[PDB]
Amino acid sequence: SATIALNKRARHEYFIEEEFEAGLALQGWEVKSLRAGKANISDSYVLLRDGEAFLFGANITPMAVASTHVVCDPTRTRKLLLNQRELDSLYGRVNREGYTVVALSLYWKNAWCKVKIGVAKGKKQHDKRSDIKEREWQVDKARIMKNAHR
RNA sequence: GGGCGUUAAGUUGCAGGGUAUAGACCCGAAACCCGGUGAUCUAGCCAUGGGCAGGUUGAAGGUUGGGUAACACUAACUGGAGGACCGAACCGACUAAUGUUGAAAAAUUAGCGGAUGACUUGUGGCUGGGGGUGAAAGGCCAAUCAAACCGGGAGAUAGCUGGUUCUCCCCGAAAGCUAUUUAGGUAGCGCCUCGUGAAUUCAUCUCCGGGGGUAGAGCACUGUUUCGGCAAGGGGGUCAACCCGACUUACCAACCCGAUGCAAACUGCGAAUACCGGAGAAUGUUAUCACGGGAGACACACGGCGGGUGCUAACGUCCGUC
RNA sequence: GUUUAUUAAAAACACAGCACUGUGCAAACACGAAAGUGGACGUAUACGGUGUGACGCCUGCCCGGUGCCGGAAGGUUAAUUGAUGGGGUUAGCGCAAGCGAAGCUCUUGAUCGAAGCCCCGGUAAACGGCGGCCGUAACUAUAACGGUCCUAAGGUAGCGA
RNA sequence: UUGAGCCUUGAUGUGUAGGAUAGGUGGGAGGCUUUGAAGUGUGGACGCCAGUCUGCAUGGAGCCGACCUUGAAAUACCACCCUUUAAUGUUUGAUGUUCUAACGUUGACCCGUAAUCCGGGUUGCGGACAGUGUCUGGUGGGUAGUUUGACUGGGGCGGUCUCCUCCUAAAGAGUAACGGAGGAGCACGAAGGUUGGCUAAUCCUGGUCGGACAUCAGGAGGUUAGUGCAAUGGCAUAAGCCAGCUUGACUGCGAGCGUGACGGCGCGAGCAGGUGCGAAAGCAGGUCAUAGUGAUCCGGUGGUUCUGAAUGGAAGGGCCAUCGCUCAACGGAUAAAAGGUACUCCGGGGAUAACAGGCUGAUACCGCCCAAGAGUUCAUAUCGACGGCGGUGUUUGGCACCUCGAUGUCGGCUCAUCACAUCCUGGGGCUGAAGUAGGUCCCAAGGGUAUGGCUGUUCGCCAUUUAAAGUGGUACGCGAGCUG
RNA sequence: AAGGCGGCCCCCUGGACGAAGACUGACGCUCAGGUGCGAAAGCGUGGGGAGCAAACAGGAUUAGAUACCCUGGUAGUCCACGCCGUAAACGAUGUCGACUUGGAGGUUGUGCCCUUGAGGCGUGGCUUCCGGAGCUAACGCGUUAAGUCGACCGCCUGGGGAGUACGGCCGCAAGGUUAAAACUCAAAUGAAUUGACGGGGGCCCGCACAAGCGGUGGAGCAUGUGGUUUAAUUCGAUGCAA
RNA sequence: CUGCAUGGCUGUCGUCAGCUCGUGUUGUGAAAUGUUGGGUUAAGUCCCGCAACGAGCGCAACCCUUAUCCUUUGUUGCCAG
RNA sequence: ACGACCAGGGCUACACACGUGCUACAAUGGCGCAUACAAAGAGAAGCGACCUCGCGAGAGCAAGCGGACCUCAUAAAGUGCGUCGUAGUCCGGAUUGGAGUCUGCAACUCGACUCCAUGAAGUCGGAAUCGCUAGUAAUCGUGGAUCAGAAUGCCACGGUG
RNA sequence: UGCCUGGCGGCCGUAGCGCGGUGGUCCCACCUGACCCCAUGCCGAACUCAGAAGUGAAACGCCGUAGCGCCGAUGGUAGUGUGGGGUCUCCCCAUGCGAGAGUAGGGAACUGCCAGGCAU
RNA sequence: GGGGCUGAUUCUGGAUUCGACGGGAUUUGCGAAACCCAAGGUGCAUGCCGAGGGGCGGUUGGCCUCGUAAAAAGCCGCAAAAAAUAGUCGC
Ligand SMILES: [Mg+2]
Ligand SMILES: [Mg+2]
Ligand SMILES: [Mg+2]
Ligand SMILES: [Mg+2]
Ligand SMILES: [Mg+2]
Ligand SMILES: [Mg+2]
Ligand SMILES: [Mg+2]
Ligand SMILES: [Mg+2]
Ligand SMILES: [Mg+2]
Ligand SMILES: [Mg+2]
Ligand SMILES: [Mg+2]
Ligand SMILES: [Mg+2]
Ligand SMILES: [Mg+2]
Ligand SMILES: [Mg+2]
Ligand SMILES: [Mg+2]
Ligand SMILES: [Mg+2]
Ligand SMILES: [Mg+2]
Ligand SMILES: [Mg+2]
Ligand SMILES: [Mg+2]
Ligand SMILES: [Mg+2]
Ligand SMILES: [Mg+2]
Ligand SMILES: [Mg+2]
Ligand SMILES: [Mg+2]
Ligand SMILES: [Mg+2]
Ligand SMILES: [Mg+2]
Ligand SMILES: [Mg+2]
Ligand SMILES: [Mg+2]
Ligand SMILES: [Mg+2]
Ligand SMILES: [Mg+2]
Ligand SMILES: [Mg+2]
Ligand SMILES: [Mg+2]
Ligand SMILES: [Mg+2]
Ligand SMILES: [Mg+2]
Ligand SMILES: [Mg+2]
Ligand SMILES: [Mg+2]
Ligand SMILES: [Mg+2]
Ligand SMILES: [Mg+2]
Ligand SMILES: [Mg+2]
Ligand SMILES: [Mg+2]
Ligand SMILES: [Mg+2]
Ligand SMILES: [Mg+2]
Ligand SMILES: [Mg+2]
Ligand SMILES: [Mg+2]
Ligand SMILES: [Mg+2]
Ligand SMILES: [Mg+2]
Ligand SMILES: [Mg+2]
Ligand SMILES: [Mg+2]
Ligand SMILES: [Mg+2]
Ligand SMILES: [Mg+2]
Ligand SMILES: [Mg+2]
Ligand SMILES: [Mg+2]
Ligand SMILES: [Mg+2]
Ligand SMILES: [Mg+2]
Ligand SMILES: [Mg+2]
Ligand SMILES: [Mg+2]
Ligand SMILES: [Mg+2]
Ligand SMILES: [Mg+2]
Ligand SMILES: [Mg+2]
Ligand SMILES: [Mg+2]
Ligand SMILES: [Mg+2]
Ligand SMILES: [Mg+2]
Ligand SMILES: [Mg+2]
Ligand SMILES: [Mg+2]
Ligand SMILES: [Mg+2]
Numbered sequence A: 001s002a003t004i005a006l007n008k009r010a011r012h013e014y015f016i017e018e019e020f021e022a023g024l025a026l027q028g029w030e031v032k033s034l035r036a037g038k039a040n041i042s043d044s045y046v047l048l049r050d051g052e053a054f055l056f057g058a059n060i061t062p063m064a065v066a067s068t069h070v071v072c073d074p075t076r077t078r079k080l081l082l083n084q085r086e087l088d089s090l091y092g093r094v095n096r097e098g099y100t101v102v103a104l105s106l107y108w109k110n111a112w113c114k115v116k117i118g119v120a121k122g123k124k125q126h127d128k129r130s131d132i133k134e135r136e137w138q139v140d141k142a143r144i145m146k147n148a149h150r
Numbered sequence B: 001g002g003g004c005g006u007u008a009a010g011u012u013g014c015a016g017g018g019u020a021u022a023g024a025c026c027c028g029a030a031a032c033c034c035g036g037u038g039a040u041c042u043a044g045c046c047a048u049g050g051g052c053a054g055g056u057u058g059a060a061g062g063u064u065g066g067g068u069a070a071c072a073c074u075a076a077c078u079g080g081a082g083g084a085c086c087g088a089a090c091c092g093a094c095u096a097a098u099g100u101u102g103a104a105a106a107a108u109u110a111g112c113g114g115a116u117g118a119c120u121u122g123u124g125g126c127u128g129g130g131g132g133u134g135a136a137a138g139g140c141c142a143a144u145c146a147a148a149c150c151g152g153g154a155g156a157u158a159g160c161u162g163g164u165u166c167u168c169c170c171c172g173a174a175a176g177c178u179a180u181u182u183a184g185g186u187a188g189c190g191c192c193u194c195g196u197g198a199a200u201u202c203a204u205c206u207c208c209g210g211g212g213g214u215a216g217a218g219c220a221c222u223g224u225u226u227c228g229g230c231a232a233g234g235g236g237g238u239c240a241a242c243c244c245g246a247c248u249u250a251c252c253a254a255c256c257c258g259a260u261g262c263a264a265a266c267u268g269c270g271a272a273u274a275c276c277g278g279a280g281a282a283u284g285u286u287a288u289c290a291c292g293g294g295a296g297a298c299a300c301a302c303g304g305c306g307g308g309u310g311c312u313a314a315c316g317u318c319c320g321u322c
Numbered sequence C: 001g002u003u004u005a006u007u008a009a010a011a012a013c014a015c016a017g018c019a020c021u022g023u024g025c026a027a028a029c030a031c032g033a034a035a036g037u038g039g040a041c042g043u044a045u046a047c048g049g050u051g052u053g054a055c056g057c058c059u060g061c062c063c064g065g066u067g068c069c070g071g072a073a074g075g076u077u078a079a080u081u082g083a084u085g086g087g088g089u090u091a092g093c094g095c096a097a098g099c100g101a102a103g104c105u106c107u108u109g110a111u112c113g114a115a116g117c118c119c120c121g122g123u124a125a126a127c128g129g130c131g132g133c134c135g136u137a138a139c140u141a142u143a144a145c146g147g148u149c150c151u152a153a154g155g156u157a158g159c160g161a
Numbered sequence D: 001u002u003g004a005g006c007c008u009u010g011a012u013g014u015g016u017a018g019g020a021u022a023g024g025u026g027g028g029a030g031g032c033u034u035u036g037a038a039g040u041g042u043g044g045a046c047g048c049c050a051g052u053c054u055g056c057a058u059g060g061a062g063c064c065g066a067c068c069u070u071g072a073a074a075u076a077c078c079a080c081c082c083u084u085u086a087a088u089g090u091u092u093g094a095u096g097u098u099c100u101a102a103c104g105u106u107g108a109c110c111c112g113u114a115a116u117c118c119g120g121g122u123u124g125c126g127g128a129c130a131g132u133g134u135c136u137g138g139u140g141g142g143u144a145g146u147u148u149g150a151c152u153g154g155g156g157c158g159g160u161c162u163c164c165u166c167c168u169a170a171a172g173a174g175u176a177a178c179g180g181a182g183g184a185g186c187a188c189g190a191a192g193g194u195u196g197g198c199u200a201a202u203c204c205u206g207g208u209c210g211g212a213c214a215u216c217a218g219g220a221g222g223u224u225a226g227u228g229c230a231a232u233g234g235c236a237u238a239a240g241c242c243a244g245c246u247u248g249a250c251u252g253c254g255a256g257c258g259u260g261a262c263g264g265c266g267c268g269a270g271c272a273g274g275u276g277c278g279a280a281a282g283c284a285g286g287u288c289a290u291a292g293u294g295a296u297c298c299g300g301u302g303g304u305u306c307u308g309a310a311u312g313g314a315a316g317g318g319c320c321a322u323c324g325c326u327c328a329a330c331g332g333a334u335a336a337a338a339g340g341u342a343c344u345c346c347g348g349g350g351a352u353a354a355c356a357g358g359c360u361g362a363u364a365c366c367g368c369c370c371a372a373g374a375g376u377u378c379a380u381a382u383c384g385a386c387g388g389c390g391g392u393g394u395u396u397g398g399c400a401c402c403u404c405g406a407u408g409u410c411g412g413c414u415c416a417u418c419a420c421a422u423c424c425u426g427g428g429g430c431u432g433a434a435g436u437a438g439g440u441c442c443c444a445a446g447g448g449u450a451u452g453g454c455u456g457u458u459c460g461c462c463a464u465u466u467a468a469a470g471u472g473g474u475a476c477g478c479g480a481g482c483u484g
Numbered sequence E: 001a002a003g004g005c006g007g008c009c010c011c012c013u014g015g016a017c018g019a020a021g022a023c024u025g026a027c028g029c030u031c032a033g034g035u036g037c038g039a040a041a042g043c044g045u046g047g048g049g050a051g052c053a054a055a056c057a058g059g060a061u062u063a064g065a066u067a068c069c070c071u072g073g074u075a076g077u078c079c080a081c082g083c084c085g086u087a088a089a090c091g092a093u094g095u096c097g098a099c100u101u102g103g104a105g106g107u108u109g110u111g112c113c114c115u116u117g118a119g120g121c122g123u124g125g126c127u128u129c130c131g132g133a134g135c136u137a138a139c140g141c142g143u144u145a146a147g148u149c150g151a152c153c154g155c156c157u158g159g160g161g162a163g164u165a166c167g168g169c170c171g172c173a174a175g176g177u178u179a180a181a182a183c184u185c186a187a188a189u190g191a192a193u194u195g196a197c198g199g200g201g202g203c204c205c206g207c208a209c210a211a212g213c214g215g216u217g218g219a220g221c222a223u224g225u226g227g228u229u230u231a232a233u234u235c236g237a238u239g240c241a242a
Numbered sequence F: 001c002u003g004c005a006u007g008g009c010u011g012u013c014g015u016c017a018g019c020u021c022g023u024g025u026u027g028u029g030a031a032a033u034g035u036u037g038g039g040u041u042a043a044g045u046c047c048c049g050c051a052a053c054g055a056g057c058g059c060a061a062c063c064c065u066u067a068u069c070c071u072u073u074g075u076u077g078c079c080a081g
Numbered sequence G: 001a002c003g004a005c006c007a008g009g010g011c012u013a014c015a016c017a018c019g020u021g022c023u024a025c026a027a028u029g030g031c032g033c034a035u036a037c038a039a040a041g042a043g044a045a046g047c048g049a050c051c052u053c054g055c056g057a058g059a060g061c062a063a064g065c066g067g068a069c070c071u072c073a074u075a076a077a078g079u080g081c082g083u084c085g086u087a088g089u090c091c092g093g094a095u096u097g098g099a100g101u102c103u104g105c106a107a108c109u110c111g112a113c114u115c116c117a118u119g120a121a122g123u124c125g126g127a128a129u130c131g132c133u134a135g136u137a138a139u140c141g142u143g144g145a146u147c148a149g150a151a152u153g154c155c156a157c158g159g160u161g
Numbered sequence H: 001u002g003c004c005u006g007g008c009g010g011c012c013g014u015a016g017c018g019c020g021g022u023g024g025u026c027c028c029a030c031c032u033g034a035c036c037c038c039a040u041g042c043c044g045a046a047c048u049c050a051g052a053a054g055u056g057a058a059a060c061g062c063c064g065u066a067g068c069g070c071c072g073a074u075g076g077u078a079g080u081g082u083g084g085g086g087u088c089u090c091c092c093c094a095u096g097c098g099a100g101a102g103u104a105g106g107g108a109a110c111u112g113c114c115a116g117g118c119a120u
Numbered sequence I: 001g002g003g004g005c006u007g008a009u010u011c012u013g014g015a016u017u018c019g020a021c022g023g024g025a026u027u028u029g030c031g032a033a034a035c036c037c038a039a040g041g042u043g044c045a046u047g048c049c050g051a052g053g054g055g056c057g058g059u060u061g062g063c064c065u066c067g068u069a070a071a072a073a074g075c076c077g078c079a080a081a082a083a084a085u086a087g088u089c090g091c
Helices: A009-013 A031-035 A127-149
Strands: A018-020 A023-025 A079-081 A100-108 A113-120
Touching (some): A009 A100, A023 A113
Antiparallel strands (some): A023 A079, A100 A113
């Protein structure tokens, strides 16, 4: 419905623990491009400086140059609007060993863009094997049980 | 009260100017329909008879020999089929030249293609026009074809070009407005001619009543616009070059005053010439108005003046005035 | 080979071959107001129509739209038939306005009523169409790749100033 | 297999109040007993299993009847029969099948008959089908009739077509362009009328959250506010604002005037009737004025002092009100209409375009004036910023001023002529001119001023030479000299 | 012969094995070049097409799935006549002759003995599993040898390049066949062993489950833990096993 | 400070039952047997078979208490008589 | 000076989440009055009987004992009575103001005991989850070490069963 | 006849602002209170009814004052009708009309009716 | 060279991105840095020249100290150079 460019690869590439429905803060010519304008949310992650967890990786194509005064930067760091009450998770459980929180998807909420955030961590190519093995094994167990019980 | 009318005579013939129907001042279309004629040219088809000199190439098939268990396959002899080959009659016209009131309303000379086949030709017949036929070009249908020829409706229509024939005298325009499947036409009005009736009816000059907002002028108003003061600040301060920043730095600078300008869509001002009315002599062949008969015209240009537009360029264009 | 007799003889038409479609005979189709004829004194290896045009490699995706074919579950639906509603008229009731039986007529139209249309599917060798946009690989370039906007599908093989 | 009339009602109910399945009302008090009732068992069904239409092997002799609740007396009576069913003949519609006599036979045999037409007789098959006439729905460029507007600095494309506001518009009115700038196809039962009362926008001071800004009290200001809306002209008596009552947002006229060719449109004192407000004189025929709008014909509604095809009526016609058009191409040609023609045709026009010729020169080319500077110093040996002044008609343009009763247009070959804003030769000045060799300027037209590849060349690129391979005018010279 | 052949019947026909015989007389084996047959898939023409099913569409899974799961579905798989001679066409083991311990079978024929029952002893062909000597690097072969020899043909000489290009032939095509060179590397491999691993299997055990019975997450409080604050919130312990 | 130089110590796997060696034998060899297989158990505990035969650390016992009974010594304890 | 000095704070704090346990949910349960049975332990800067007192903690005086002698130490659950009656309860005992006591020079940070007074939460608790196979689960009390005092923690002991 | 005040007109800046001062005999204005006649989108500030203790402050009316506002000459200038001319996007000549903006200067109104009171 | 449609999550004239990040940093108690001004203490403090300053140097010259003038001590720089990157990903 109101869904926009989403990053479903990061869901398989990470272990999503908790999610944040926090909003995004962006300048002109970009929110219009969210409707149509080729926004891409690849390589998305938070870049906490002090309390400024900007989303760094996103390429939103500028569709016009009619205002040829401001310099266009598709790789701009977008600000994020999150409650200070729930921002404690981000200044907390991020820098342990490898914890990250990445942008899973971006959609519309009554003419305002909301980017879904999620706390996760890497898999080192050995957790992926275990996940695939378990996903296949549950299916195989169900199939063999059904075949045996006819 | 208002409208229409009571007042105040028409009618029948003759001659003349219009109008309406008929052809309607005269010639001219391209086009439509109806009834007949054509296949002797040409297109196709049907039936019946002719024509294709001469010289090349050797497929199928058939024999002999080799070969195969039988085949298959190969060598030699014969073979004469090709919408075959070169090339004559015959058919056609791809190039060049001549010819263009020519020998000829498509031809001549030198070259050219097919020339045993989907060929060509003679004779007779059929296909008849919104139809015929078409190896398909809108090609042919008798030198005429995106609808053949002849006779009729039919003098079709033509807001379109041209022409309109003897004389004299008098008066004398317009090329503008409105509306228009309207712009090069038309109807009314604005103008022209004739007749009738009507009053200082009308015009020139003078005097007297009037309202402008144009030229010009100006910035009370709306915009525009330059400078100085009033004045807050900022901007790589000469200075510390780090500090309160010594604060003054050919930079923008609120509101208001003083000075200087611009304006078709600005007027606190504002003419001349224009326009209407009243009066007065003097002048004009009623020059004025109303009705009736007949028109014409509704393509204007130049020059002066005030302008839009264009480039205050155009013998350019759009308005008013003489 | 043929083609615009009389400015175009060609890449233009035709061609053998290929594909689709219609056609069970009193066949389709065409000329015919009709009879009748051709097709054809043929019989699905026959005939007509439409496209391409010997031969070799092939004819890849789409029914979204317009046609064609199969269906009548539902809605609408002609001609046709006519339940009544509303008036005209007068026998006649009313001292008068005015009610007003039957007959005949003016007008509305309950119900029946097929094809067709909407609809459900197929069919493209039927008419037809088959995308642009951003980032990303060791110097630079490009993008095998990844995301989202639409369509019914984004052009496969092959070829190319 | 199947509907209305019909074979008869087998007929279905329930006021918490209730032997409860209420007798249409009349007569309420029974035919009931051989006008053939309970007892006994219980397919279907009223099942809210109280009752019960109950149906029916055994019966073979009184259930009911008053009424208990009593808002309402029993369905025990008679039945003009409903709060609605029931089946077979039933009234003849559709579907299906059976049959033949209609009809068909481009099946066979015979006959007229010599004969593959035709007709008649026998017969097989199909069969009330097929097929034909009328009406009718759908499809139907296969065919026919047509339509596709106008202005336009040629035509097409674009834009516009009606109405209103300011300028142009030259001080009465009016006045055009594809000139310069904005709006309208409504709205109000109150935003109309009367009466009564009041008069801002804007800038300040102080004051709870309250601030460039809500509200409040005071202060400057005088229409720079407001008008239901675009602009213009006005409004202080207010035409702006608040409240009451109201419907004059009346009916029929209307002397007079203004604007229009006309159709028409607009203002209007005042008259008669009947109303609203205000004590009253007085004000009210809509809105502060200008856009808010469409003629005629045809038909829709109501009323009517009329006409009514012999009479009496009625359909019908007109009369007054009123309704249906983005006829927006808006003075509207039909209720009903798009394109191509290079296969084209006719009447016209240089009233009107493309080539040329003519007028001007925005553009084009060339010259000149001041001089930041470039140029080591030095403006001018050579260039020249920001501008201006010019000359030719030579590039691209403007006009439609001759030519559509005919002026052959690009380029190439032959043939030339003229001008100098001179390519070479000739003469000279200044040079950042040591010499050769260069730059610029001035005078000077006597002469000369290339060959091939590309492409239709003009133009242009390249290769090789020459002292040079100049720019232009002459219908962008020359087709009654030639090709195409 | 190989490829490969499965209801039944009819017709033609190839091949194989046995008791007892008769007969020609080395006529015997192999075989480059050549010839023929030859799984399926594929191609051409003419037919047919029930089911299945490349390509293709849709649905589902997945981060992605142009696939495995599902619904459709054309070529093809079915027939006749034609073309290729391609397979892990394998027994990864060429054709023919002789010899070499044994056991347990299947199929087929014949001889003999009293066949009272597939009673008993023999004797040939094919085929199956163990197994001695021997062989082999070992797996394994083992009278049907991979044991010892005899006759012949074909093939091999490091892994890639490469069974590739060119060249010749064949074929309508897809391609087949014959078959290199340049360049890189010091490796490429096979049989077996020990660990390890498997989304391989089997067995066993422990309050590991089941069975029971009580508890912890709900609520005061206690120390302990992580985070926060703070001057420090004193050090380490950080899954069972803090 | 460095338990990422260590000693010592401790927890878990786990009181789970395996971890090895000598000789011999087998295979050219890496290597295997023993340690595998049936019963049985808490167990590599016991037995049988098998080129295995034995041994070490090992799972048990030897160590500490309870459960019947004997003797000795009798205080601060017992009252059988 | 990262070596070293002592005094005052903080290791005991906090919007939070977590391991573990004690405490309760009330009729087998709390309120009180006879009444019963254990083992093993520690004791001289000590264990510390009596007695006088204190509603209570303990104050004063204080015997004996390196202990089969004395103390800590009338153990309870059990038992027989009464009583309450299903209620935020005579359940549940936390927070609160004040009072003293033990204790160590000093308990605002920061002890424990006491008893008068307010008398919280909580009323068998999701998903999950842990322990036990016999004198063990489960309940009741006692004892021991650390230490001036400051155990729901730790280690042991028996009763029921 | 003089002065003052109140009401209604002529005219709409020489007519009105600013500064200072004036007046309570009469008029004028503030002022007291409210059952009522009347009303507050509340509230006797506005309407109104019943009244003169106080007042001339506010507001009125008056006199001077040139900071204003305003009027406004003569002359000159621009423009313009007529007729004739130039070097013709614009001007000149003869004649007629002659602005606006300035300057000198003026400018603190004029006036009629009705009613009251002062002096007479 | 020209027109015509979109630059509008409403094409619906009234959106607290719910949240971080600037705002009078509007608001309620409050510490001399959210500040701050004649009286009890009675000591050698105010302008006085000062003194060059914490490990080192300097501060608007009176931000430290005094009592007969000085060590300077309350802040900055030399210094405290460790600030330099989500995850997966050669050994
Ligand atoms: Mg012919
Ligand atoms: Mg021969
Ligand atoms: Mg030939
Ligand atoms: Mg020939
Ligand atoms: Mg001949
Ligand atoms: Mg010839
Ligand atoms: Mg010839
Ligand atoms: Mg024709
Ligand atoms: Mg002809
Ligand atoms: Mg003729
Ligand atoms: Mg005729
Ligand atoms: Mg006629
Ligand atoms: Mg004629
Ligand atoms: Mg005509
Ligand atoms: Mg006509
Ligand atoms: Mg006329
Ligand atoms: Mg006169
Ligand atoms: Mg002017
Ligand atoms: Mg005209
Ligand atoms: Mg004319
Ligand atoms: Mg004109
Ligand atoms: Mg003209
Ligand atoms: Mg003129
Ligand atoms: Mg020709
Ligand atoms: Mg030809
Ligand atoms: Mg073709
Ligand atoms: Mg296709
Ligand atoms: Mg379709
Ligand atoms: Mg159909
Ligand atoms: Mg139908
Ligand atoms: Mg037509
Ligand atoms: Mg036109
Ligand atoms: Mg036009
Ligand atoms: Mg005018
Ligand atoms: Mg009023
Ligand atoms: Mg009126
Ligand atoms: Mg108005
Ligand atoms: Mg009509
Ligand atoms: Mg009549
Ligand atoms: Mg009548
Ligand atoms: Mg009537
Ligand atoms: Mg109408
Ligand atoms: Mg009009
Ligand atoms: Mg013509
Ligand atoms: Mg021209
Ligand atoms: Mg000419
Ligand atoms: Mg010029
Ligand atoms: Mg210089
Ligand atoms: Mg001529
Ligand atoms: Mg001519
Ligand atoms: Mg010269
Ligand atoms: Mg020279
Ligand atoms: Mg010179
Ligand atoms: Mg096959
Ligand atoms: Mg499938
Ligand atoms: Mg799929
Ligand atoms: Mg092989
Ligand atoms: Mg052989
Ligand atoms: Mg063997
Ligand atoms: Mg090959
Ligand atoms: Mg065992
Ligand atoms: Mg201690
Ligand atoms: Mg003057
Ligand atoms: Mg003057």
